[PDB]
């Protein structure tokens, strides 16, 4: 099954038996995609075990997979298991059950519901300034992911459940240890049903048994939880827990990690951090509380977040599974081949970005954003199955950037890893934690 | 009220009672703004009747009005009336209504939407080449405004509604004949010179259902858009308004559609006629432009989205023509509260105007400003260009929302036409071109040129 790409005339690295091309992951998913982006061109194919993975870079072919042929061919992602009861997760759901869950959780982040969340986040924006003021009056380098993780945990637990959880909070402690052995599932896809019918999972039982019991305590009979009960009156009780774990993890690990990526760039680029503080003071003088209209008005704030998401796409890749024999843009893709879109390799392609290594917010300016292909820059994906919490994540991260830059400035320390080396492992994280100096204003 | 600029120490022509400085418009908006820019300097003020109009020319002062203090101070334009139900149009909406309509219509011209419209425009390009070939085999000078307006009406009606109204031409198509008379602003006509100068005459006409647009063209466009709703039966301009309606009104949908139909017809065809006039009067520029198209698109290759963005000299010819002929001429903003920008106090109610025509021909910014030199916008010299002195589409949140669509439709026309034909002047070609001394930016005599095939 490894002579597939040799047959279709699609180039790619020579796979090893059983392992495939996984031994080339020693530098990471991103480094392997960039090396293959230069070695083989625009389209190459490699193997994750015996699972054939086809990488595409043509924007027209990307649009056909993500947007056009979504409900017809490229509907589901790579089968991920064993998950146990977490099979009902919208991020892992497939075919008809996904459309029911996607349409059930879509009204969670409308412009009206997002406008209601601004006063809720405005409360947590003050405790963030107060806790950072303690670490500002005392010369101590701040572990940013720590305090941002506490801020990111309160937002998603309040804007989705209405419950207040407020340094050793058992949620942040449990939600973080979903962070190895997967090396086997890529090589034993047949061991996935070995653990399904016999009920074995990959997620630790304690992080699920706690969250399953916490959602039941949350079931105090318009929120993200209130939508799932009104739609129940068909939604199951165990399916309700699976969607909460995805929202709790996405609201904590994604927002806080990107916020840590933004502060590092602003501290390592003083003129960029200064120009952003001046704009924030202009739109919001006297440290005025931010509103939904003032968040979208700050364009340089949007140009900074879009540039950081370009350099640091936490998802790195985009995966879709071809469910039947099709031919898109004059290229045949067999059934079962996982079509992959290297977001990291395309965000730093020298043939689409000038100086793709450096932090230049001028790329996303309204003067220059017309030269950016929306299918090359995909930090949240695209199509009907993109990031459903995209507008919620962009709002929460900007609310933290506004409320903090009004009161503090960020400078590098001695222990600040400059340049920031990304973790050579799996998910997109720095090797050493992001620590910076905080000075009051 | 005519002593406002005397109080603020701002220069300007002495106004007359009631009329103000309107009588200096005997040569037009452009000649008046250029005479004031040379006599009074960087900042001057005049009166459109009793309405004080402050003209600014400083790049930092223009950037503050158009970009910086947009949502807070300079958000709306001069009140234009009587318009009737057309007050809900995005170009005339004010404050929260415009902010709701602007975000509602911005996804119409994204990079993906414009790339979807290329195969649709490519269809009408072949019809344009065919009609230009009939008047080319026979030695007959062509009124470019006619053949480009029909092409501009085909493109904007299909890419925004999905309906094909003009077919094979049809030199008596109703849309072009009704849209060309939608609004013909003239000073020699009293009605406009009657208002403009006096604003205590707008609310009377509103209660009489009197509008600046004739009822014949509004009642037709009211039923034409209503007939243009065919669902159940793509995602275009019409599809965006209905999906956002499911709070958009029904008559508000026709209001925004009338603006898109007019802008797609008048702006695209008028600038194209200005471009072809410079190409015929400068065969070297037309030759050098034809060689670039043959290099990117050999053997008459069909133009695509990516190949259009590659032609630099095509972008340089369009930019220099838009410099010599800014169809908007002016950029006006209303100061809604007392402010002090760049060390200058501006009272509330004063209309801040940016003379785009006078700035595009300023000798202290452009070397030989009256000469057609596309080399000004070359990558060697484009860095020596201030983006707030050359504003053919405005700047800031309330700029031309159809800028990237207009630039594409004109280039897609220039490519497919120059691939097959060359343009030369005639006996009846007005050389030099005299601009209309009236209101809107048009030539006096229509641009007529001979069409030779290749
Ligand atoms: C900087 C922050 C975030 C980034 C960059 C991000 C990125 C992404 C990406 C790339 C995808 C896949 C798109 C595709 O496959 O085409 C995705 C899916 C998803 N995102 Fe996010 N995300 C972020 C934050 C969030 C947040 C705060 C939530 C809150 C609920 C969330 C919920 C989801 C869900 C549920 C999915 C799966 C959707 C589906 O399977 O239909 N994400 N995200
Ligand atoms: C060569 C072609 C065109 C030129 C030079 C041009 C120029 C301009 C200028 C200078 C403005 C005012 C900007 C400001 O005040 O800051 C404007 C506004 C506008 N233009 Fe155009 N335009 C062109 C074609 C088009 C097209 C094709 C459309 C299609 C819809 C369009 C729709 C509009 C609208 C709706 C506004 C008002 C925007 C608002 O009020 O928010 N224009 N145009
Ligand atoms: C990396 C590897 C090989 C291990 O496999 C993936 O884990 N890969 C996913 C498949 S299942 C994933 C598992 C999971 C993780 C944490 C908690 C619960 C389940 C999953 O459901 N996570 C949804 C998290 C929400 C989120 C996270 C980041 C950005 N936005 C939203 C495929 C996938 C990757 C990235 C985005 C969406 C889907
Ligand atoms: C000569 C005078 C007084 C009229 O003076 C202006 O022309 N002044 C406008 C004010 S109302 C204008 C009226 C109108 C005209 C024709 C059809 C419908 C309404 C208006 O709304 N037309 C929008 C047309 C779209 C367009 C036209 C040209 C370029 N792009 C887009 C203020 C104004 C000027 C320039 C751009 C936008 C607004």
Author numbering:
A (entry chain B): 29 to 194, 199 to 211, 218 to 259, 269 to 280, 289 to 496
B (entry chain A): 29 to 261, 268 to 280, 289 to 496
Give sentences from the paper.
In humans, CYP3A4 is the major liver and intestinal P450 isoform with a large and malleable active site which can accommodate chemically diverse compounds. As a result, CYP3A4 clears the majority of administered drugs along with other foreign compounds, such as environmental pollutants, insecticides and pesticides. To further investigate the SAR of ritonavir-like inhibitors, we designed eleven (series V) analogues to test whether the further extension of the pyridyl-linker by one or two atoms would be beneficial or not.
The lowest IC50 was derived for 3a (0.16 μM). Another notable improvement was in thermostability of ligand-bound CYP3A4, whose melting temperature (Tm) increased by 5.3–8.1 °C upon 3a–d ligation. The wild-type (WT) CYP3A4–3a complex was re-crystallized in the C2 space group, where one of the two molecules in the asymmetric unit (molecule A) was well defined. Comparison of the subseries lead compound, 3a, with the shorter 4f stereoisomer, demonstrates how a one-atom linker extension alters the ligand binding mode. The longer pyridine–R1 spacer allows 3a to adopt a more relaxed conformation, with a larger tilt toward the heme. Additional stabilization is provided by the Boc-group, mediating multiple van der Waals interactions but disordered in 4f.
